[PDB]
Write a protein that binds this ligand. Structure first.
Ligand SMILES: Nc1ncnc2c1ncn2[C@@H]1O[C@H](COP(=O)(O)OP(=O)(O)O)[C@@H](O)[C@H]1O
Lengths: 52, 475
Protein backbone atom coordinates (compact mmCIF):
# COMPACT_ATOMS: atom_id res chain seq x y z
CA UNK A 1 0.00 0.00 0.00
CA UNK A 2 1.53 3.28 -1.18
CA UNK A 3 0.36 6.40 0.66
CA UNK A 4 1.22 9.43 -1.47
CA UNK A 5 0.87 12.82 0.23
CA UNK A 6 0.20 15.85 -1.95
CA UNK A 7 -1.66 19.17 -2.06
CA UNK A 8 -4.96 20.43 -3.44
CA UNK A 9 -3.90 23.83 -4.84
CA UNK A 10 -1.60 24.48 -7.77
CA UNK A 11 1.41 26.75 -8.22
CA UNK A 12 3.29 24.50 -5.77
CA UNK A 13 6.37 24.18 -7.97
CA UNK A 14 7.04 20.55 -8.82
CA UNK A 15 6.72 18.89 -5.44
CA UNK A 16 3.70 16.81 -6.42
CA UNK A 17 5.54 16.06 -9.66
CA UNK A 18 8.46 14.58 -7.71
CA UNK A 19 6.05 12.75 -5.39
CA UNK A 20 4.21 11.13 -8.30
CA UNK A 21 7.56 10.34 -9.94
CA UNK A 22 8.77 8.45 -6.86
CA UNK A 23 5.38 6.74 -6.63
CA UNK A 24 5.54 5.62 -10.27
CA UNK A 25 9.05 4.31 -9.65
CA UNK A 26 7.94 2.36 -6.58
CA UNK A 27 4.86 0.93 -8.31
CA UNK A 28 6.75 -0.15 -11.43
CA UNK A 29 9.46 -1.70 -9.25
CA UNK A 30 7.08 -3.60 -6.96
CA UNK A 31 4.68 -4.83 -9.66
CA UNK A 32 7.45 -6.72 -11.49
CA UNK A 33 8.15 -9.12 -8.61
CA UNK A 34 4.38 -9.68 -8.39
CA UNK A 35 3.43 -7.71 -5.28
CA UNK A 36 -0.16 -6.50 -5.65
CA UNK A 37 -0.11 -2.74 -5.14
CA UNK A 38 -2.81 -0.46 -3.75
CA UNK A 39 -2.68 3.33 -3.83
CA UNK A 40 -3.88 5.74 -1.17
CA UNK A 41 -3.46 9.45 -1.75
CA UNK A 42 -3.97 12.88 -0.25
CA UNK A 43 -4.92 15.73 -2.56
CA UNK A 44 -6.41 16.00 -6.04
CA UNK A 45 -3.02 16.60 -7.67
CA UNK A 46 -1.79 13.02 -7.22
CA UNK A 47 -5.15 11.81 -8.50
CA UNK A 48 -4.89 13.92 -11.64
CA UNK A 49 -1.27 12.82 -12.05
CA UNK A 50 -1.86 9.06 -11.76
CA UNK A 51 -5.44 8.57 -13.01
CA UNK A 52 -4.80 7.70 -16.65
CA UNK B 1 11.38 56.93 -86.05
CA UNK B 2 13.67 59.59 -84.58
CA UNK B 3 12.92 61.49 -81.39
CA UNK B 4 14.50 63.94 -78.97
CA UNK B 5 14.97 63.81 -75.21
CA UNK B 6 13.23 66.71 -73.45
CA UNK B 7 13.34 65.81 -69.75
CA UNK B 8 15.09 63.32 -67.46
CA UNK B 9 14.10 62.37 -63.90
CA UNK B 10 16.16 59.49 -62.52
CA UNK B 11 14.92 56.29 -64.17
CA UNK B 12 12.29 58.09 -66.29
CA UNK B 13 12.77 59.80 -69.66
CA UNK B 14 10.41 62.07 -71.59
CA UNK B 15 10.81 61.96 -75.36
CA UNK B 16 9.33 64.00 -78.20
CA UNK B 17 8.62 62.60 -81.66
CA UNK B 18 7.70 64.79 -84.63
CA UNK B 19 5.99 62.67 -87.29
CA UNK B 20 4.64 59.48 -85.71
CA UNK B 21 4.53 58.10 -82.18
CA UNK B 22 5.50 54.62 -81.01
CA UNK B 23 2.95 52.44 -79.21
CA UNK B 24 3.35 51.43 -75.56
CA UNK B 25 5.91 48.79 -74.47
CA UNK B 26 8.02 49.57 -77.55
CA UNK B 27 11.80 49.83 -77.29
CA UNK B 28 13.90 52.91 -78.03
CA UNK B 29 17.68 53.18 -78.37
CA UNK B 30 19.55 56.30 -77.25
CA UNK B 31 22.23 57.32 -79.73
CA UNK B 32 24.42 60.05 -78.24
CA UNK B 33 25.51 57.85 -75.35
CA UNK B 34 28.46 55.68 -74.35
CA UNK B 35 26.69 52.36 -73.77
CA UNK B 36 23.52 50.94 -75.37
CA UNK B 37 20.85 52.71 -73.35
CA UNK B 38 17.39 51.24 -73.98
CA UNK B 39 14.08 52.83 -73.03
CA UNK B 40 10.73 51.04 -72.74
CA UNK B 41 7.65 53.15 -73.43
CA UNK B 42 5.09 53.26 -70.61
CA UNK B 43 2.71 56.19 -71.18
CA UNK B 44 1.50 58.83 -73.61
CA UNK B 45 1.04 62.42 -72.50
CA UNK B 46 0.11 64.59 -75.49
CA UNK B 47 2.07 67.08 -77.58
CA UNK B 48 3.51 63.97 -79.27
CA UNK B 49 5.30 63.26 -75.98
CA UNK B 50 6.14 59.82 -74.61
CA UNK B 51 7.29 58.61 -71.20
CA UNK B 52 9.80 55.78 -70.93
CA UNK B 53 11.76 53.77 -68.37
CA UNK B 54 15.50 53.27 -68.81
CA UNK B 55 17.24 49.90 -68.57
CA UNK B 56 20.43 51.62 -67.36
CA UNK B 57 21.72 54.79 -65.72
CA UNK B 58 20.80 58.25 -66.99
CA UNK B 59 24.04 59.97 -65.92
CA UNK B 60 25.29 61.62 -69.11
CA UNK B 61 21.99 62.24 -70.90
CA UNK B 62 21.21 65.66 -72.38
CA UNK B 63 17.99 67.48 -73.22
CA UNK B 64 18.32 67.26 -76.99
CA UNK B 65 19.89 63.83 -77.36
CA UNK B 66 18.55 61.58 -80.11
CA UNK B 67 16.48 58.41 -79.77
CA UNK B 68 15.52 55.76 -82.34
CA UNK B 69 12.36 53.65 -82.17
CA UNK B 70 12.89 49.96 -82.89
CA UNK B 71 9.22 49.48 -83.80
CA UNK B 72 8.77 46.49 -81.48
CA UNK B 73 9.25 45.73 -77.77
CA UNK B 74 12.46 44.33 -76.32
CA UNK B 75 13.46 41.09 -78.05
CA UNK B 76 15.33 38.27 -76.30
CA UNK B 77 16.80 35.34 -78.28
CA UNK B 78 15.39 31.86 -77.77
CA UNK B 79 16.34 28.32 -78.68
CA UNK B 80 18.64 25.63 -77.35
CA UNK B 81 21.44 28.21 -77.66
CA UNK B 82 20.31 30.17 -74.59
CA UNK B 83 20.89 27.01 -72.54
CA UNK B 84 23.99 27.01 -70.38
CA UNK B 85 24.22 30.79 -70.64
CA UNK B 86 23.57 34.00 -68.72
CA UNK B 87 21.56 36.81 -70.30
CA UNK B 88 20.59 40.24 -69.00
CA UNK B 89 17.16 41.79 -69.55
CA UNK B 90 18.00 42.99 -73.08
CA UNK B 91 19.29 39.56 -74.07
CA UNK B 92 22.93 40.66 -74.16
CA UNK B 93 25.10 37.88 -72.68
CA UNK B 94 27.36 38.86 -69.79
CA UNK B 95 29.19 35.53 -69.54
CA UNK B 96 32.13 36.83 -71.63
CA UNK B 97 32.04 33.80 -73.92
CA UNK B 98 30.76 35.30 -77.18
CA UNK B 99 27.36 36.28 -78.58
CA UNK B 100 24.14 34.25 -78.57
CA UNK B 101 23.78 32.65 -82.05
CA UNK B 102 20.03 32.03 -81.83
CA UNK B 103 17.76 32.12 -84.86
CA UNK B 104 14.54 33.44 -83.30
CA UNK B 105 13.82 36.19 -80.78
CA UNK B 106 10.77 36.47 -78.52
CA UNK B 107 9.16 39.58 -77.06
CA UNK B 108 9.54 40.29 -73.35
CA UNK B 109 5.80 41.04 -73.24
CA UNK B 110 3.30 38.32 -74.16
CA UNK B 111 -0.34 37.72 -73.32
CA UNK B 112 -1.06 34.84 -70.97
CA UNK B 113 -2.49 31.48 -72.05
CA UNK B 114 -6.27 31.36 -72.20
CA UNK B 115 -8.72 29.55 -69.94
CA UNK B 116 -9.30 26.57 -72.23
CA UNK B 117 -5.54 25.98 -72.67
CA UNK B 118 -4.92 25.02 -69.05
CA UNK B 119 -4.34 21.61 -67.47
CA UNK B 120 -4.49 21.22 -63.67
CA UNK B 121 -3.17 17.71 -63.06
CA UNK B 122 -2.13 16.80 -59.49
CA UNK B 123 1.48 15.65 -59.25
CA UNK B 124 4.16 15.63 -56.58
CA UNK B 125 7.84 16.51 -56.34
CA UNK B 126 10.61 14.57 -54.60
CA UNK B 127 12.46 17.37 -52.81
CA UNK B 128 14.21 15.17 -50.25
CA UNK B 129 13.14 17.55 -47.46
CA UNK B 130 10.95 16.24 -44.66
CA UNK B 131 8.90 19.34 -43.87
CA UNK B 132 7.73 19.92 -47.44
CA UNK B 133 7.47 16.24 -48.37
CA UNK B 134 5.19 15.73 -45.34
CA UNK B 135 3.19 18.88 -44.61
CA UNK B 136 3.44 21.02 -47.78
CA UNK B 137 3.87 18.68 -50.75
CA UNK B 138 5.14 20.45 -53.86
CA UNK B 139 3.09 20.25 -57.05
CA UNK B 140 4.72 19.06 -60.27
CA UNK B 141 3.70 21.69 -62.80
CA UNK B 142 2.56 24.28 -60.26
CA UNK B 143 3.72 27.35 -58.39
CA UNK B 144 5.61 27.18 -55.10
CA UNK B 145 6.42 30.03 -52.75
CA UNK B 146 9.11 30.50 -50.12
CA UNK B 147 8.12 33.47 -47.96
CA UNK B 148 10.68 34.92 -45.60
CA UNK B 149 12.51 37.90 -44.19
CA UNK B 150 16.28 38.40 -44.31
CA UNK B 151 18.58 35.66 -43.07
CA UNK B 152 16.22 32.69 -42.77
CA UNK B 153 17.57 30.49 -45.55
CA UNK B 154 15.64 31.16 -48.74
CA UNK B 155 18.67 31.11 -51.02
CA UNK B 156 20.04 28.01 -49.25
CA UNK B 157 16.66 26.31 -49.61
CA UNK B 158 16.52 27.16 -53.32
CA UNK B 159 20.05 25.84 -53.85
CA UNK B 160 19.07 22.61 -52.09
CA UNK B 161 15.93 22.27 -54.22
CA UNK B 162 18.06 22.87 -57.31
CA UNK B 163 20.50 20.15 -56.25
CA UNK B 164 17.68 17.72 -55.45
CA UNK B 165 15.38 18.43 -58.42
CA UNK B 166 17.12 19.96 -61.43
CA UNK B 167 19.92 17.40 -61.54
CA UNK B 168 17.26 14.65 -61.26
CA UNK B 169 14.86 16.35 -63.71
CA UNK B 170 16.06 15.67 -67.26
CA UNK B 171 14.01 18.45 -68.80
CA UNK B 172 15.04 22.11 -68.94
CA UNK B 173 15.21 24.82 -66.31
CA UNK B 174 15.68 28.55 -65.81
CA UNK B 175 16.95 30.69 -62.96
CA UNK B 176 16.08 34.37 -62.61
CA UNK B 177 17.73 36.67 -60.10
CA UNK B 178 15.87 39.91 -59.33
CA UNK B 179 17.99 41.82 -56.84
CA UNK B 180 20.16 39.01 -55.50
CA UNK B 181 23.84 39.05 -54.62
CA UNK B 182 26.26 38.81 -57.53
CA UNK B 183 28.39 36.62 -55.27
CA UNK B 184 25.72 33.92 -55.09
CA UNK B 185 25.07 34.37 -58.80
CA UNK B 186 28.69 33.53 -59.59
CA UNK B 187 28.51 30.71 -57.04
CA UNK B 188 25.50 29.20 -58.82
CA UNK B 189 27.26 29.56 -62.18
CA UNK B 190 30.32 27.73 -60.86
CA UNK B 191 28.32 25.05 -59.04
CA UNK B 192 26.47 24.38 -62.30
CA UNK B 193 29.69 24.21 -64.32
CA UNK B 194 30.88 21.81 -61.61
CA UNK B 195 27.82 19.55 -61.41
CA UNK B 196 27.39 19.45 -65.19
CA UNK B 197 24.15 21.44 -65.27
CA UNK B 198 26.20 23.81 -67.45
CA UNK B 199 28.67 22.13 -69.82
CA UNK B 200 31.02 24.79 -71.17
CA UNK B 201 33.78 23.72 -73.55
CA UNK B 202 36.45 26.12 -74.83
CA UNK B 203 36.83 25.50 -78.55
CA UNK B 204 39.99 26.75 -80.19
CA UNK B 205 39.98 30.33 -81.47
CA UNK B 206 38.31 31.35 -78.20
CA UNK B 207 34.91 29.96 -79.18
CA UNK B 208 32.68 28.08 -76.75
CA UNK B 209 30.33 25.10 -76.80
CA UNK B 210 27.63 25.02 -74.12
CA UNK B 211 26.09 21.90 -75.70
CA UNK B 212 24.78 19.61 -72.96
CA UNK B 213 23.53 22.32 -70.60
CA UNK B 214 20.15 22.05 -68.88
CA UNK B 215 19.70 25.47 -67.26
CA UNK B 216 19.42 29.05 -68.48
CA UNK B 217 20.28 32.09 -66.38
CA UNK B 218 18.85 35.61 -66.24
CA UNK B 219 20.33 38.14 -63.82
CA UNK B 220 19.16 41.63 -63.04
CA UNK B 221 20.73 42.32 -59.69
CA UNK B 222 20.85 44.93 -56.96
CA UNK B 223 23.37 46.91 -59.03
CA UNK B 224 20.64 47.74 -61.55
CA UNK B 225 17.90 50.38 -61.83
CA UNK B 226 14.23 49.60 -61.20
CA UNK B 227 13.55 49.50 -64.92
CA UNK B 228 16.25 46.84 -65.25
CA UNK B 229 14.82 44.95 -62.25
CA UNK B 230 11.09 45.02 -63.10
CA UNK B 231 11.60 43.38 -66.52
CA UNK B 232 13.84 40.36 -65.83
CA UNK B 233 11.16 37.92 -64.70
CA UNK B 234 9.33 38.64 -67.96
CA UNK B 235 12.48 37.72 -69.90
CA UNK B 236 12.83 34.46 -67.98
CA UNK B 237 9.14 33.75 -68.58
CA UNK B 238 9.59 34.28 -72.31
CA UNK B 239 12.56 31.90 -72.25
CA UNK B 240 10.43 29.29 -70.49
CA UNK B 241 7.37 29.86 -72.68
CA UNK B 242 9.52 29.10 -75.72
CA UNK B 243 10.33 25.71 -74.19
CA UNK B 244 6.86 24.79 -72.94
CA UNK B 245 5.11 26.06 -76.10
CA UNK B 246 7.30 25.06 -79.05
CA UNK B 247 9.59 22.36 -77.64
CA UNK B 248 6.68 20.96 -75.62
CA UNK B 249 9.04 20.16 -72.73
CA UNK B 250 8.47 20.43 -68.99
CA UNK B 251 10.58 23.19 -67.46
CA UNK B 252 11.60 24.38 -64.03
CA UNK B 253 11.70 28.07 -63.13
CA UNK B 254 13.49 29.27 -60.00
CA UNK B 255 13.05 32.98 -59.21
CA UNK B 256 14.93 34.87 -56.50
CA UNK B 257 13.33 37.91 -54.80
CA UNK B 258 10.23 38.53 -56.88
CA UNK B 259 9.51 41.22 -54.26
CA UNK B 260 11.87 43.51 -56.17
CA UNK B 261 9.44 43.35 -59.10
CA UNK B 262 7.14 45.37 -56.82
CA UNK B 263 9.82 47.44 -55.08
CA UNK B 264 10.96 48.80 -58.46
CA UNK B 265 7.41 49.85 -59.27
CA UNK B 266 7.24 51.52 -55.87
CA UNK B 267 10.40 53.53 -56.62
CA UNK B 268 9.19 54.29 -60.17
CA UNK B 269 5.51 55.25 -59.94
CA UNK B 270 6.35 58.35 -57.89
CA UNK B 271 8.47 59.50 -60.83
CA UNK B 272 5.81 58.43 -63.34
CA UNK B 273 3.29 60.73 -61.63
CA UNK B 274 1.03 58.18 -59.91
CA UNK B 275 -0.66 58.57 -56.53
CA UNK B 276 0.77 56.18 -53.91
CA UNK B 277 -1.25 53.46 -52.22
CA UNK B 278 -1.28 52.47 -48.54
CA UNK B 279 2.44 51.93 -47.91
CA UNK B 280 3.69 53.71 -51.02
CA UNK B 281 2.94 50.69 -53.21
CA UNK B 282 1.21 51.10 -56.55
CA UNK B 283 -2.46 51.07 -57.46
CA UNK B 284 -1.42 48.48 -60.08
CA UNK B 285 0.10 46.17 -57.45
CA UNK B 286 -2.34 43.36 -58.25
CA UNK B 287 -2.54 43.58 -62.04
CA UNK B 288 1.21 44.00 -62.56
CA UNK B 289 1.64 40.76 -60.58
CA UNK B 290 -1.22 38.81 -62.14
CA UNK B 291 -0.03 39.61 -65.66
CA UNK B 292 3.24 37.96 -64.61
CA UNK B 293 1.78 34.97 -62.76
CA UNK B 294 -0.87 33.99 -65.33
CA UNK B 295 1.93 33.32 -67.82
CA UNK B 296 3.17 30.71 -65.33
CA UNK B 297 0.72 27.85 -65.82
CA UNK B 298 0.71 24.24 -66.93
CA UNK B 299 -1.00 23.83 -70.30
CA UNK B 300 -1.73 21.15 -72.91
CA UNK B 301 1.60 21.87 -74.66
CA UNK B 302 4.02 21.68 -71.73
CA UNK B 303 4.46 22.50 -68.06
CA UNK B 304 6.19 25.09 -65.88
CA UNK B 305 7.07 24.18 -62.34
CA UNK B 306 7.87 27.39 -60.48
CA UNK B 307 9.73 28.18 -57.25
CA UNK B 308 9.50 31.85 -56.21
CA UNK B 309 11.29 33.45 -53.25
CA UNK B 310 9.14 36.18 -51.67
CA UNK B 311 10.70 38.77 -49.39
CA UNK B 312 8.72 39.87 -46.34
CA UNK B 313 9.69 43.42 -45.32
CA UNK B 314 10.02 44.06 -41.58
CA UNK B 315 8.86 40.46 -41.05
CA UNK B 316 5.30 41.67 -41.80
CA UNK B 317 3.22 39.08 -43.65
CA UNK B 318 0.25 41.49 -43.82
CA UNK B 319 1.99 43.70 -46.38
CA UNK B 320 -0.09 44.11 -49.56
CA UNK B 321 2.55 42.50 -51.78
CA UNK B 322 2.76 39.11 -49.99
CA UNK B 323 -0.97 39.35 -49.23
CA UNK B 324 -1.71 39.49 -52.96
CA UNK B 325 0.96 36.90 -53.76
CA UNK B 326 -0.60 34.37 -51.39
CA UNK B 327 -3.63 34.06 -53.69
CA UNK B 328 -1.57 32.99 -56.73
CA UNK B 329 0.30 29.98 -55.32
CA UNK B 330 -0.30 26.23 -55.40
CA UNK B 331 2.16 25.52 -52.58
CA UNK B 332 3.56 27.61 -49.75
CA UNK B 333 6.43 27.56 -47.27
CA UNK B 334 6.72 30.36 -44.70
CA UNK B 335 10.07 30.59 -42.91
CA UNK B 336 10.31 32.23 -39.50
CA UNK B 337 12.91 34.04 -37.45
CA UNK B 338 11.47 32.85 -34.15
CA UNK B 339 12.15 29.32 -35.40
CA UNK B 340 15.53 30.21 -36.93
CA UNK B 341 16.75 31.67 -33.62
CA UNK B 342 16.28 28.19 -32.14
CA UNK B 343 18.86 26.90 -34.62
CA UNK B 344 16.25 24.84 -36.48
CA UNK B 345 17.00 24.70 -40.21
CA UNK B 346 14.99 24.72 -42.47
CA UNK B 347 13.11 27.20 -40.27
CA UNK B 348 9.73 26.32 -41.80
CA UNK B 349 6.59 27.26 -39.88
CA UNK B 350 4.37 24.23 -40.63
CA UNK B 351 1.19 26.11 -39.64
CA UNK B 352 1.61 29.12 -41.92
CA UNK B 353 2.88 26.71 -44.56
CA UNK B 354 0.16 24.99 -46.57
CA UNK B 355 -0.62 23.39 -49.93
CA UNK B 356 -3.42 22.16 -52.17
CA UNK B 357 -1.88 18.71 -52.76
CA UNK B 358 -2.37 17.48 -49.18
CA UNK B 359 -5.88 16.07 -49.60
CA UNK B 360 -6.46 12.32 -49.19
CA UNK B 361 -7.36 12.04 -52.89
CA UNK B 362 -3.79 13.03 -53.85
CA UNK B 363 -1.61 11.83 -51.00
CA UNK B 364 -2.80 8.75 -49.18
CA UNK B 365 -4.89 8.57 -46.05
CA UNK B 366 -1.99 7.67 -43.77
CA UNK B 367 -0.05 10.66 -45.10
CA UNK B 368 -3.10 12.91 -44.71
CA UNK B 369 -3.82 11.74 -41.16
CA UNK B 370 -0.17 11.99 -40.08
CA UNK B 371 0.05 15.55 -41.41
CA UNK B 372 -3.19 16.58 -39.72
CA UNK B 373 -2.16 14.95 -36.43
CA UNK B 374 1.17 16.78 -36.54
CA UNK B 375 -0.65 20.07 -37.16
CA UNK B 376 -3.01 19.35 -34.26
CA UNK B 377 -0.06 18.58 -31.99
CA UNK B 378 1.82 21.74 -32.93
CA UNK B 379 -1.29 23.90 -32.47
CA UNK B 380 -1.94 22.34 -29.06
CA UNK B 381 1.66 23.17 -28.18
CA UNK B 382 1.29 26.72 -29.50
CA UNK B 383 -1.77 27.20 -27.29
CA UNK B 384 0.32 26.62 -24.13
CA UNK B 385 3.13 29.07 -24.90
CA UNK B 386 1.70 31.88 -22.76
CA UNK B 387 0.99 29.80 -19.67
CA UNK B 388 4.40 28.12 -20.01
CA UNK B 389 6.16 31.48 -20.28
CA UNK B 390 4.39 32.88 -17.21
CA UNK B 391 4.03 29.89 -14.90
CA UNK B 392 6.03 26.98 -16.31
CA UNK B 393 5.62 23.37 -17.35
CA UNK B 394 4.97 22.27 -13.75
CA UNK B 395 1.49 23.82 -13.80
CA UNK B 396 0.52 21.66 -16.77
CA UNK B 397 -1.25 18.32 -16.55
CA UNK B 398 0.34 15.10 -17.84
CA UNK B 399 -1.46 15.02 -21.19
CA UNK B 400 -0.22 18.56 -21.83
CA UNK B 401 3.31 17.61 -20.77
CA UNK B 402 3.26 14.65 -23.16
CA UNK B 403 2.02 16.99 -25.90
CA UNK B 404 4.83 19.46 -25.18
CA UNK B 405 7.42 16.68 -25.22
CA UNK B 406 6.24 15.24 -28.53
CA UNK B 407 5.91 18.72 -30.04
CA UNK B 408 9.49 19.67 -29.16
CA UNK B 409 10.63 16.26 -30.41
CA UNK B 410 8.89 16.63 -33.77
CA UNK B 411 10.12 20.22 -34.07
CA UNK B 412 13.69 18.99 -33.69
CA UNK B 413 12.95 16.06 -36.01
CA UNK B 414 11.70 18.46 -38.70
CA UNK B 415 15.23 19.76 -39.21
CA UNK B 416 17.62 18.65 -41.92
CA UNK B 417 21.29 19.35 -42.76
CA UNK B 418 21.57 20.22 -46.43
CA UNK B 419 24.51 19.51 -48.72
CA UNK B 420 25.15 23.18 -49.57
CA UNK B 421 25.37 24.02 -45.85
CA UNK B 422 28.44 21.80 -45.35
CA UNK B 423 30.77 24.78 -45.81
CA UNK B 424 29.52 26.56 -42.66
CA UNK B 425 27.97 23.59 -40.83
CA UNK B 426 30.44 20.82 -41.61
CA UNK B 427 27.93 18.00 -41.29
CA UNK B 428 27.07 16.09 -44.48
CA UNK B 429 23.71 16.33 -46.17
CA UNK B 430 20.74 14.02 -45.64
CA UNK B 431 18.25 13.21 -48.36
CA UNK B 432 15.09 11.80 -46.76
CA UNK B 433 12.38 9.79 -48.49
CA UNK B 434 8.68 10.19 -47.83
CA UNK B 435 7.75 6.75 -46.46
CA UNK B 436 10.66 7.07 -44.03
CA UNK B 437 9.43 10.50 -42.95
CA UNK B 438 5.91 9.13 -42.54
CA UNK B 439 6.98 6.11 -40.49
CA UNK B 440 9.08 8.36 -38.26
CA UNK B 441 6.22 10.82 -37.71
CA UNK B 442 3.80 7.95 -37.04
CA UNK B 443 6.13 6.50 -34.42
CA UNK B 444 6.78 9.87 -32.77
CA UNK B 445 3.04 10.49 -32.55
CA UNK B 446 2.24 7.00 -31.26
CA UNK B 447 4.87 7.17 -28.53
CA UNK B 448 7.57 4.78 -29.72
CA UNK B 449 10.24 7.48 -29.25
CA UNK B 450 9.30 9.17 -25.95
CA UNK B 451 12.14 7.31 -24.22
CA UNK B 452 14.70 9.14 -26.35
CA UNK B 453 16.01 12.62 -25.46
CA UNK B 454 15.14 15.88 -27.20
CA UNK B 455 18.56 16.77 -28.65
CA UNK B 456 18.78 13.35 -30.33
CA UNK B 457 16.39 14.49 -33.10
CA UNK B 458 18.52 17.51 -34.08
CA UNK B 459 19.83 17.16 -37.65
CA UNK B 460 19.54 13.39 -38.08
CA UNK B 461 17.21 12.65 -41.01
CA UNK B 462 15.47 9.38 -40.20
CA UNK B 463 15.17 7.58 -36.88
CA UNK B 464 18.10 5.16 -37.14
CA UNK B 465 20.41 8.18 -36.90
CA UNK B 466 18.38 9.53 -33.98
CA UNK B 467 18.69 6.25 -32.09
CA UNK B 468 22.42 5.99 -32.83
CA UNK B 469 22.85 9.56 -31.57
CA UNK B 470 20.88 8.81 -28.40
CA UNK B 471 23.08 5.76 -27.86
CA UNK B 472 26.27 7.79 -28.30
CA UNK B 473 24.87 10.54 -26.05
CA UNK B 474 24.07 8.02 -23.31
CA UNK B 475 27.84 7.75 -22.75
N1 LIG C 1 20.89 24.48 -43.76
C1 LIG C 1 21.27 25.59 -42.91
N2 LIG C 1 21.71 25.10 -41.77
C2 LIG C 1 22.13 25.93 -40.80
N3 LIG C 1 22.11 27.26 -41.00
C3 LIG C 1 21.67 27.77 -42.18
C4 LIG C 1 21.26 26.95 -43.12
N4 LIG C 1 20.87 27.71 -44.18
C5 LIG C 1 21.06 28.99 -43.87
N5 LIG C 1 21.55 29.05 -42.62
C6 LIG C 1 21.69 30.36 -42.45
O1 LIG C 1 20.76 31.24 -43.26
C7 LIG C 1 21.41 32.36 -43.40
C8 LIG C 1 21.35 32.84 -44.82
O2 LIG C 1 20.21 32.37 -45.46
P1 LIG C 1 19.82 33.07 -46.90
O3 LIG C 1 18.50 32.51 -47.38
O4 LIG C 1 20.99 32.97 -47.84
O5 LIG C 1 19.60 34.65 -46.55
P2 LIG C 1 18.47 35.58 -47.30
O6 LIG C 1 17.10 35.07 -46.92
O7 LIG C 1 18.62 37.02 -46.83
O8 LIG C 1 18.65 35.51 -48.79
C9 LIG C 1 23.01 32.07 -42.99
O9 LIG C 1 23.29 32.67 -41.67
C10 LIG C 1 23.14 30.84 -42.93
O10 LIG C 1 24.20 30.46 -41.92
Amino acid sequence: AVLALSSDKGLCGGVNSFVAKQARIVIKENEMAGNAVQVYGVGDKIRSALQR
Amino acid sequence: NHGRITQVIGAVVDVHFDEQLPPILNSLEVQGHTNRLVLEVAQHLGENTVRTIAMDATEGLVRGQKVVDTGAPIQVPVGVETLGRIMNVIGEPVDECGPVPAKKTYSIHRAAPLFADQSTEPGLLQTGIKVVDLLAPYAKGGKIGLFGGAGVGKTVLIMELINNVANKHGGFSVFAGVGERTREGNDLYHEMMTTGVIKRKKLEDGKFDFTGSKAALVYGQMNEPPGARARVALTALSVAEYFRDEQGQDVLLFIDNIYRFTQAGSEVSALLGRIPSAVGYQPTLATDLGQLQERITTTKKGSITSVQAVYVPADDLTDPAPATTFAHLDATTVLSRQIAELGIYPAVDPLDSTSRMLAPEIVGQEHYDTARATQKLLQDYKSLQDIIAILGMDELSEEDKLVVSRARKIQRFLSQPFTVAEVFTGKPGRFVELPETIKSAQTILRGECDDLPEMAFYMCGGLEEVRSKAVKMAQ
